[PDB]
Symmetry: D3
Subunit: 158 residues, 6 copies
């Protein structure tokens, strides 16, 4: 049984994240979508909210398990028995910072292999930050988010 | 009559911004220099100050209109009847984030065409952030700002 | 203002990404010259005559586009055409550094010509004529990336 | 899941960076095909027969690797091999834009094939087969970058 | 006597910084490791702490002098009689922002030549920010820091 | 310290950007060798003899520059010249990834040689010898980018 972890802040989870996790479930037996608490990022949604949103957004995928964590990423991957670490790559600016994290995760857990997947062209220019910025200005972001997430974001900003 | 919008935080407007807006006025009949309130960026100058500074800095250009806005960028462009959205491109790091905004603006207003212009080599390595950092340390930034802006920045920091 | 813009390239062959850019250009400028380089520098798959006819058929629906071959520097041609705008397509996969070099050099050669970067649809942001040709030459399906007339001419060229 | 992955390239010659990537791939997928392109497009230093034998000897210690030559598009070969994973090595010096083009094109040609980017050790993150060949051709020491069998074959090729 | 300045926030100084300063001492007669106060960055260590840490971390290098500063970087270089300004370059994302600072420093002090050095592959994927993030999550960062710095970081976070 | 630095390149032809870099290098090191690669690998516009004479005339005003041709790897030549500094120009349009590969490879070949990246004036940050040659070959004005002796020699070369 191959177990992969897809960690991130997911504040909130977008269609780009759904795309990545869906690709991951087609490749690995079990995928842990791991939501980092990330207090330094001052997230819009609490960890509990982010977990609830991602669980509903991924309920259609049978081999996904959504879990929150505040640990060091490498320790949490070891403790979940994961040997693959999934990250999405949309652009060059992502790639450079992604390399630092992957080399650090390799130093901390050499058997955890980092994998980068590329999202659909449809989601190649979006991010949670961008979607929140548009939504803060009352712009329509229904296209970019799961239904439950879009409702939660509208409600949070109301 | 072709109407172009050149939006930004302009905190404060620099010679690089003047270069871009001047190129835009040579290409389009009317240019709206649109200053975003941008409270999340915690700007050094108030929106009212930024508008006043840009109006004086662009007074020599007959077909420029300076306007502040707090709306979604795409809604403000529609409401100004603009069909061109101007942005400057100085480097690769700009380009990637510029692409996200342009694809988002296209989703929100498909008839608003994003245009990128390249500033003079003279202003290719400056930014409002960099000019403010130098000025906070009492470094001479007269070369990079319109006269009225340089006075305002010295006064603000005094 | 009655602006004349130039959209230069080798267009070997013209793709849906090029049609997207030129269409956007026609919505913002009064006259767009789709300027096809004679460029035997990197031996093109289609000859200049083929490239021009294909681009004319593929842009025939755009009333303010004129397709013209040129053999000089793109700035020398823009000057002779009285163009004041130079259209460059900026894909997510473009060599931005090259575009910077080109634009600063064009500005030195012809300061009255302004380089304007337009962005294609996300659909065409990850392709190039080079990639399309190599895929087609190596028996891959490129139908989606090309105008129908171009696809028919490309199949004919690869058959021989 | 019994995954079949493909790791394509020219492998002219196979380097320690390629061995690093294929080793990582064998730890995550059940079967990895190290797919060597016939590619006389940019006249390779080693012939296809040489490239295959070198890669077999250099990966002989990996039980789930199969070295196979191919002359078609990498997607046409992946399809015929029933591979659903395409391995790409991502060095700190890789052309990320090219990798994006390639992956989106491979996805168009074969949607059921997923591109997977793996990162080599920092030790091999700043090399390329091209750089290694040019250094070796110009009398520089490349012993550190190659498997011993490859280093012996490269010295033999440069001697003539 | 050629004098080079190697300025930075050094919050805290890492093995990557030690690598750069060591390369600089092999090339120039005297190297000033100059620690910027950087209050806008809200540093984890005080300037006094950062200076003490870097002095101990570089004590083995005879031609290094560690000095704190709050001045404009170019004025401090002039006042130290430096004619070379050293900066490390690990990646493309560094390079673009490094170019802006170097062109600004050249405008402010044309005789101060910026030099970029490349660290060892060993430290090409680390940064003070990354090391602090790992350490905040109790991850082992002994590999990336001088002994005295690692102790100070553990103590600061305890 | 009495440092010897090497500034290698093809210098085909030497431009104002190269003069800017070598001038900056002479202000920081005691002796700078402007090292001209014999490089017939990508058939140069000027021969090695032409490239050397042009670079000597163009740097004659710099007392601590020595112009020397070399045909070996840049590290093998730096070693034989007892250079401990390798100068690389970093333009805003440079291929940073290539510079990283090159520097890490030079460090492997000769650890005692330190790569030093210098930045040219903003005036020359968006040019390359390749761009200058292509513009000049295609009837564009490159006077601004070259030393006067180089401009005269380039016009003579293009006339034939
Ligand atoms: C200024 C300039 C440069 C140049 N080529 C070139 C060379 C080297 C570099 C490093 C760069 Cl950045 C560009 N061309 N090619 C042309 C003619 C042409 C037009 C359209 C497509 C193909 C050819 N016109 C022009 N004008
Ligand atoms: C989709 C595609 C493109 C392509 N070449 C290519 C062309 C142009 C661009 C601008 C890009 Cl991004 C790529 N090749 N080469 C192959 C065959 C092959 C496999 C492994 C190594 C060498 C050759 N297969 C394939 N498949
Ligand atoms: C280490 C090394 C590589 C190399 N060429 C090269 C090859 C491939 C890649 C991908 C890269 Cl990054 C570089 N050359 N060319 C030389 C000789 C020379 C000196 C100056 C200008 C031209 C030629 N010396 C050297 N040393």
């Amino acid at each position: 049984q191959k177990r992969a972890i897809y960690p991130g802040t997911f504040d909130p989870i977008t269609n780009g994240h759904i795309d990545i996790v869906t690709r991951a479930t087609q490749m690995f037996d079990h995928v842990i979508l791991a939501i980092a608490a990330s207090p330094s990022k001052k997230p819009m949604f609490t960890l509990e909210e982010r977990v609830a949103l991602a669980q509903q957004a991924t309920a259609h995928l049978g081999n996904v398990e959504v879990v929150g964590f505040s640990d060091l990423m490498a320790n949490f991957a070891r403790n979940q028995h994961a040997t693959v670490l999934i990250r999405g790559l949309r652009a060059v600016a992502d790639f450079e910072y992604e390399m630092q994290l992957a080399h650090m995760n390799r130093h901390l857990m050499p058997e955890l292999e980092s994998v980068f997947l590329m999202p659909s062209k449809e989601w190649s220019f979006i991010s949670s930050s961008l979607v929140k910025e548009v939504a803060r200005h009352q712009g329509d972001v229904t296209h970019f988010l799961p239904e439950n997430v879009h409702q939660a974001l509208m409600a949070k900003l109301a």
